[PDB]
């Protein structure tokens, strides 16, 4: 019942968002041209949707977005598509040039000309809200906008505002599939950002989601417009308890002191089920004791690392739909006993259930089934410490011959700002090494 603002950086950002918002405007009845076919407006308190919208006059609803990219080319598809009328045409910022996968070029040299126009449409929005929960910062570790420009937007947003909850959904370099020869510089370079100036960093790779689309959804020729919808329903559920009545609610601050065992160790890796096709539905009567079991298969982790080799340190399970709160207990019961699902000792409690009442919602022409239950684990673990290690063996080579250094030092940075990032993805690794040893 309270509100949270969203930022999108980079074009993977913007296009994750296109689907995000086509879904939100469907969960609440908000047509493409801003209206919700209305009633006699009798009231005394009426905040059915407010968390992702704002009412203005005569019946129009306007979303709270900050779409930002230096590439001037992706936003235009917005500005003339079927979502023309709806956004507020003074939010979608659009620079002049693009950083071209050069990190140093989104930090200062091509981005010093847009922060002052985007901090402004933040602050004109952080004050049309009565009380503010959090900042959802969608971006993409891959390219260049989403690595420098975000490391600028987040630092500004963390010394001006300072103490808010700043979430972060971010696409990570895969281990094999890639589309940029200079990715392992960007990544190691944005690590100083996703430690000092954020709290939850939900990473999501790509080959993983590709699998999750080929094995389960019976679609073998996917596109980006079918990975983004899954990364969209993770977000319609981590923020599904601010927005509907619940039988056991969990609020975007409860999440963190349930989910973060220390100041730094805060990189959970999400999951979601049921993801079933249109005809592989009726052969399943998928009741709760099943969909809580799909979440721990090391073949639905949206981040390609093996959770078996590791140890969980927390969990969080935001069921939703037609779920009554005993079945969940027998379910967590079954899970608590298994071998090869090794919870660490110092967290014998284990879990944090949370339920809602609204069925997860469908998007026409989509590729998911009208299920009546759902779940999105957000399970901190130690296994993720074996994805970042990969990018290290992709950087301690492309840097031993200073390859591609010139494009970077060319726009201000120095040769040191690389070894800093080295040691600072080395400490993170040492620390998930540590907090997993048993005492």
């Amino acid at each position: 019942m309270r509100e949270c603002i969203s930022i999108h950086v980079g074009q993977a950002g913007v296009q994750i968002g296109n689907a995000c918002w086509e879904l939100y405007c469907l969960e609440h009845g908000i047509q493409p041209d801003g209206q919700m076919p209305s009633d006699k407006t009798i009231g005394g308190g009426d905040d059915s949707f407010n968390t992702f919208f704002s009412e203005t006059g005569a019946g129009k609803h306007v979303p709270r977005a900050v779409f930002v990219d230096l590439e001037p080319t992706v936003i235009d598809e917005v500005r003339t598509g079927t979502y023309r009328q709806l956004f507020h045409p003074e939010q979608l910022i659009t620079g002049k040039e693009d950083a071209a996968n050069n990190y140093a070029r989104g930090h200062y040299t091509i981005g010093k000309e847009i922060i002052d126009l985007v901090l402004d449409r933040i602050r004109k929005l952080a004050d049309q809200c009565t009380g503010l929960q959090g900042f959802l910062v969608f971006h993409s570790f891959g390219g260049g906008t989403g690595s420098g420009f975000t490391s600028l937007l987040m630092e500004r947003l963390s010394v001006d505002y300072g103490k808010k909850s700043k979430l972060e959904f971010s696409i990570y370099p895969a281990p094999q599939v890639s589309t940029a020869v200079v990715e392992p510089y960007n990544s190691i370079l944005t690590t100083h950002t996703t430690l000092e100036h954020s709290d939850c960093a939900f990473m999501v790779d790509n080959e993983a989601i590709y699998d999750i689309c080929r094995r389960n959804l019976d679609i073998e020729r996917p596109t980006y417009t079918n990975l983004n919808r899954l990364i969209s329903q993770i977000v319609s559920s981590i923020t599904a308890s601010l927005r509907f009545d619940g039988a056991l609610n969990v609020d975007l601050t409860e999440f963190q002191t349930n989910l973060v065992p220390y100041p730094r160790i805060h990189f959970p890796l999400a999951t979601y089920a049921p993801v079933i096709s249109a005809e592989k539905a009726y052969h399943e009567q998928l009741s709760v004791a099943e969909i809580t079991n799909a979440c721990f298969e090391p073949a639905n982790q949206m981040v390609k690392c093996d959770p078996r080799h590791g140890k969980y340190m927390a969990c969080c399970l935001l069921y939703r739909g037609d779920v009554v709160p005993k079945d969940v207990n027998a379910a967590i019961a079954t899970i608590k006993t298994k071998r090869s699902i090794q919870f660490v000792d110092w967290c014998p409690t284990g879990f944090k259930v949370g339920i809602n009442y609204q069925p997860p919602t469908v998007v026409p022409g989509g590729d998911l089934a009208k299920v009546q239950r759902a779940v999105c684990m957000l399970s901190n673990t130690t296994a993720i410490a074996e994805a970042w290690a990969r990018l290290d063996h992709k950087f301690d080579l492309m840097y031993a011959k200073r390859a591609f250094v010139h494009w970077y030092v060319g726009e201000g940075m120095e040769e040191g700002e690389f070894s800093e990032a080295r040691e600072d993805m080395a400490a993170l690794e040492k620390d998930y090494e540590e907090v997993g040893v048993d005492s």
Binding site: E254, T257, W346, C347, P348, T349, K352
Partner: protein, 426 residues
Amino acid sequence: MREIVHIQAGQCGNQIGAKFWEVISDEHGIDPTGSYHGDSDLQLERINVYYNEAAGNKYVPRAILVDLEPGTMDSVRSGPFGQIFRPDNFVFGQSGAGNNWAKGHYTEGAELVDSVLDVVRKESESCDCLQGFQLTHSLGGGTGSGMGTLLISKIREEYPDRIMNTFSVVPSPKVSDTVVEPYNATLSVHQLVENTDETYCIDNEALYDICFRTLKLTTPTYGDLNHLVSATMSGVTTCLRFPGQLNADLRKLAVNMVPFPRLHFFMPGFAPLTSRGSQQYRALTVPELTQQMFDAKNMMAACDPRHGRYLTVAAVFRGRMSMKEVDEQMLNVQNKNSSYFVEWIPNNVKTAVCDIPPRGLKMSATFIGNSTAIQELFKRISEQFTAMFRRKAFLHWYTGEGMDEMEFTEAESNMNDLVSEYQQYQ
């Protein structure tokens, strides 16, 4: 006279209460709208123990609903029997609480404690000579534990003598649902022990048992767990509100049941409890009640009392009894289990009898036990703590609001002593 006020704090407290005040309200014949449609002139005779008069013949209860997230206080208001709380009574801050005990005892509640401490006084002076504050609240969440304990230690400084209740739902490992219970709980209990004189420990594991096995329900929504803790509460105070043949009030029980100053962690229970497919296959007179009542599977508090000994026991009956039934049943179940009742206290069972049943039935009994078995309830908690704290896990979210590290050790020691001093009487 003999008036009782009522404090709810947390999502629990409120959803318990919205059922409480439906059983109470239908004992005394009260419609939802505050009006009255009783039938026997006996109902409206002590109506002013849980109620207040208001013009035009409306009756409005004495609630103080409290919580830090402004959703609950709306859910209450739309339910059945919601028109009835008079609206000034709610007090809601607007920033949730976040399963962090700190934010209920130092920061985000310390700036809401006064807008409730300033409705207790508004509601403590329309009464001739009141008797105590109830306080129904879950010991696990963030408002309930911290905010509620703060409220209680403020109430016990402007009223250092009146009696003090608490109906605290306790953590249980087999149905745990949060990750920092063993901080919430062991921090709450270091301050319930110094500042109340009776505490009924309900807990959710056992309350689920009692609806799988005995009442034989397919699906226990929460609406049928709260509907049992409501009946225990309605029981423990039925002599204040009806004529009886041996009257017992909160003071009665609170003097007959507490054999030292600290050991006041009771466990409740209720009987009859029949899956009303099975009801025609059992006709209860007194002995059926008193045998179900002492079953290991009607202690709403999760523990098996056989590994312990009842120090003292109380039984508040309701219905027309024949009192030697009561007396000789109690002597019977005191001589059949000579090893489960402590020796150096004789005649352990306090009794009482009211005279109106809960409507629809003909006989009912509310057991209140005080066993040394609770040796185990606070014991498992300590494990789920002395591992977590031993790695400062989850700790920062507490230091961030003012608490110290030391304060945790204080709590720990002060909930290990307690177990030691039930353990002597074993």
